[PDB]
Homo-oligomer: A and B are copies of this chain.
Amino acid sequence: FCRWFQRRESWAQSRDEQNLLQQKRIWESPLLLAAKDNDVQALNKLLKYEDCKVHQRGAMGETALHIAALYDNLEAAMVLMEAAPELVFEPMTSELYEGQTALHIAVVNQNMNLVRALLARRASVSARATGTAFRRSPCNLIYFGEHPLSFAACVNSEEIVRLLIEHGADIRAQDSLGNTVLHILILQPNKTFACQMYNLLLSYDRHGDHLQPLDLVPNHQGLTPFKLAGVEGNTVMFQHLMQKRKHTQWTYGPLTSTLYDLTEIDSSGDEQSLLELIITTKKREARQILDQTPVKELVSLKWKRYGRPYFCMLGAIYLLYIICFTMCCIYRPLKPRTNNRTSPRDNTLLQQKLLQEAYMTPKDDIRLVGELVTVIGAIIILLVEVPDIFRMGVTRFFGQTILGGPFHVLIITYAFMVLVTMVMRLISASGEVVPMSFALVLGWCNVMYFARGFQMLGPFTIMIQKMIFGDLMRFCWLMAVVILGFASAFYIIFQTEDPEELGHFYDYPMALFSTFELFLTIIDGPANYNVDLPFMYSITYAAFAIIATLLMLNLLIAMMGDTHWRVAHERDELWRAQIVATTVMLERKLPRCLWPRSGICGREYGLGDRWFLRVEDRQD
């Protein structure tokens, strides 16, 4: 141990030391045991002392009022405020617990009548309990904000909440995150009780401050509560929050006619829309928000009327881009050999050694125009996604990768080799086959990026990705463990052996190439049938055949059959997740002369400047 860095996490161990030492500070001091209990008979003596430390601190800086607030002794705490009036005017002062007063803690007890007596002792509710135990993180179980009625918001006690409001509680105060009361209601674990908490707290603003008047306010990172429920995936309240958002028109027996506001769902301007905030997460449960009556009908209108024409024609032109690129790359200039087959005895079989800048003929001019287009088209790829990563971060760019498929890397990786294949053409380098070789195969792989606009072959592409980054990768870290052994084991066998017959391997690098082919059974297999092989070979070849082909190959095809039925229900909305992610990027990049806006605008219908959308259906 000499170079440990960022691999301790001893702060969680440190607060545990803060836990037990604080209990020792309880145990040594006598009056804190009387603060741990009622102990009212001895407590009458404790305040009738000379030097009873009424303002002393714990290990994290409590008082007896703080401990009585913990162990909810309402009778004993009545004695505390008698000779110590200043005692209510002190919060917690530790790094872990900063700003927490006893008025906060009785709210955490969530069934108290001391809170009346505490506010009878002029207790301010203007505290900000912003200790490090109160920040949202995967190391605390709660996240309650900074404020007393905000703390009361998370515990569902209408008797206390209304009693907080009637003593001057500013409801529209915010936290260090910029989040107010209403933001914290969304992130609660119990989705049930917050709806009554939301509906009751609506009734107390009624205020002339028309500036974002009670809930239209974002945080420092610009997140509004109606949009926040889509972020954290509130299935329950988003239906409930849509009620004042939805406006109805008329009904017809079992039929109705409604209208949607839509004004903070579609991308109006350059602002972060709701739809953009859907796919920009790793949270799983927020993706099934797309099965709601305002949501998918916007999606299943504009892709039906605009996307499928725009996707296929964009799909069509990319198909044209590669075939002419295939046309030129199969027609490369070529001469025969010049250097007379000099050095290797029967170990060369190439005879061409390709041409140079001597190029001018009335046939290459077709190829000259042909390879001219694919260079300039490759620049176009480097003018639409290269400007993205100047502002879409690095990890923020890779955040899109796993959700929507890793195609955005490979399309630049296509054009990256296209830069090479004209430079080395220009300077007349030796290796032209190798940079074209990736360049030919990486283009046709990007055709499956357009295998998304059809239901019949769309979702099949997804579980390919779920096995390349999934079960094939875990298979590779055992397959290589098998083949690195047997190949070296095979190599010593025919080491003492002439390679003119059974030249399946004669040297160690080709041996690994051979034994890998023995693993996948894509080759023939060694047999000479004229000379008996060495005595070890017949043992080791068959044993390799059993545990790899009969066992390990057929095991690998079995484990993927386990995958499909337990990913079958989820892949349908993944296919829906393809469309919307395709929709927003296609909508945002393409200009205003194209793409008429969704919905129906106002400005002629007496309904504002906004944009409405309807639906009608049988209620049955």
List residues of chain A with CB under 8 Å of any chain B CB: 7, 9, 16-17, 19-21, 23-24, 27, 70-71, 108-110, 141-142, 155, 189-190, 249-250, 252-255, 257, 305, 309, 326, 329-330, 332, 334, 346-354, 433-434, 436-437, 440-441, 443-445, 447-448, 451, 456-457, 460-461, 463-464, 467-468, 472-475, 477-478, 481-482, 484-486, 488-489, 491-493, 495-501, 503-504, 506, 508, 510, 513, 516-517, 520-525, 527-532, 534-536, 538, 540, 542, 545-547, 549-552, 554-565, 568, 600, 605-607, 612, 614, 616-618, 620
Contact between A527 and B523 (Cβ–Cβ < 8 Å)? yes
10 nearest CB pairs, A to B: A444-B485, A503-B529, A352-B496, A457-B474, A554-B557, A441-B489, A440-B489, A562-B564, A558-B561, A523-B525
Please, which residue of chain B has its CB at the minimum distance from the CB of A71? B250
Q: Are B558 and A350 closer than 8 Å at their CB atoms?
A: no
B485 touches A441 (CB 8 A): yes
Bound Cα distance from A71 to B250, whole angstroms: 8
Q: Which of B141, B441, B501 contacts A617 (CB under 8 A)?
A: B141
Q: Which residues of B contact A496 (CB under 8 A)?
A: 334, 350-354, 433
Query: A269 → chain B, closest Cβ, in Å?
Result: 24
Inter-subunit contact A478/B492 (CB<8 Å): no
Q: Which residue of B lies closest to A485 (CB)?
A: B444
> When chains A and B are docked, how far (Å) is the Cα of A556 from the Cα of B551?
10
| A477 and B492 within 8 A (CB) | no
**Chain B residue nearest to A70 in the complex (CB):** B250
A613 to B, closest residue via Cβ: B16
A491 to chain B: closest residue by CB = B330
Evaluate contact between B550 and A556: CB separation under 8 angstroms. Answer: yes
Nearest CB of B to A380, in Å: 21
Q: Are A485 and B437 in contact (CB under 8 A)?
A: no
Q: A498's contact among B349, B492, B565, by CB below 8 Å, is which?
A: B349
* CB of A235 to closest CB in B, whole Å: 18
Q: Once the chains bind, are B460 and A474 in contact (CB under 8 Å)?
A: yes
A556 surroundings in chain B (CB, below 8 A): 550, 554
Copies in the complex: 2
Bound CA span A227–B407, Å: 55
Closest Cβ of chain B to A226, distance in Å, is 24
**Chain B: CB-nearest residue to A461:** B478
Contacts of A478 in B (CB 8 A): 448, 451, 457, 460-461
Among A348, A550, A620, find the residue whose CB has the most chain B CB atoms closer than 10 A: A550
Neighbouring B residues of A525 by C-beta, 8 Å:
517, 522-524
Q: Which residues of B contact A559 (CB under 8 A)?
A: 460, 564
Can you identify 12 A-B contacts, CB atoms within 8 angstroms? Answer: A70-B252, A110-B253, A349-B531, A448-B481, A451-B478, A456-B474, A460-B475, A467-B551, A468-B547, A468-B551, A513-B538, A558-B563
A17 to B443, CA, bound (A): 46
Most buried by B among A473, A498, A535: A498
Given the complex, which residues of B lie within 8 Å of A346, measured CB to CB? 530-531
Residue of B nearest to A503 (CB): B529
* CB-CB nearest in chain B for A472: B551
With beta carbons under 8 angstroms apart, the residue of B456, B524, B540, B614 that contacts A523 is B524
Interface contact B562-A434, CB-CB below 8 Å: no
A108: min CB distance to chain B, Å: 5
Of the residues B477, B497, B545, B600, contact of A451 by C-beta under 8 Å: B477
- A17-B600, A499-B529 given; 15 more Cβ-contact pairs under 8 Å: A23-B249, A141-B617, A142-B255, A330-B488, A350-B498, A352-B496, A434-B536, A437-B540, A447-B481, A457-B474, A503-B529, A517-B525, A554-B556, A554-B560, A558-B564
Q: Given A492-B436, A551-B472: A529 and B558 within 8 A (CB)?
A: no
Residues of B within 8 A of A477 (CB): 451, 457
Chain B residues, Cβ within 8 Å of A352: 495-497
- On chain B, the residues within 8 Å of A563 by CB distance are 558
Q: A19's contact among B21, B249, B445, by CB below 8 Å, is which?
A: B249
Beta-carbon contact of B347 and A532 below 8 Å: yes
Q: Are B493 and A437 in contact (CB under 8 A)?
A: yes
CB closest chain-B residue, reference A605 = B20
Q: State A496–B354 Cα separation when bound (angstroms).
A: 8
- Cα separation A348 to B475 with both chains bound (whole Å): 40
A20 to B530, CA, bound (A): 76
A552 vs B467: C-alpha distance when bound (angstroms):
10
Q: Is the CB of A614 within 8 A of B19?
A: yes
Q: A437-B493, A437-B536 are in contact. Are A257 and B606 (CB under 8 A)?
A: no
User: A19-B249, A464-B555, A557-B554 given as contacts; is B536 within 8 A of A481 (CB)?
Assistant: no
B522 adjacent to A521 (CB under 8 Å): yes
- For A109, the chain B residues whose CB sits under 8 A away are 253
CB distance from A465 to the nearest CB of B (A): 11
Residues of B within 8 A of A252 (CB): 70, 108
Answer whether A332 and B495 are a contact pair too, CB < 8 Å, given A108-B252, A551-B467, A552-B464.
Answer: yes
Residue of B495, B499, B620 touching A189 (CB-CB under 8 A): B620
A273 to B488, CA, bound (A): 44
Q: How far apart are the CA atoms of A68 and B146 in the complex, in Å? A: 54
Note all chain B residues with C-beta closer than 8 A to A493: 433, 437
Nearest residue (CB) in B for A529 is B503
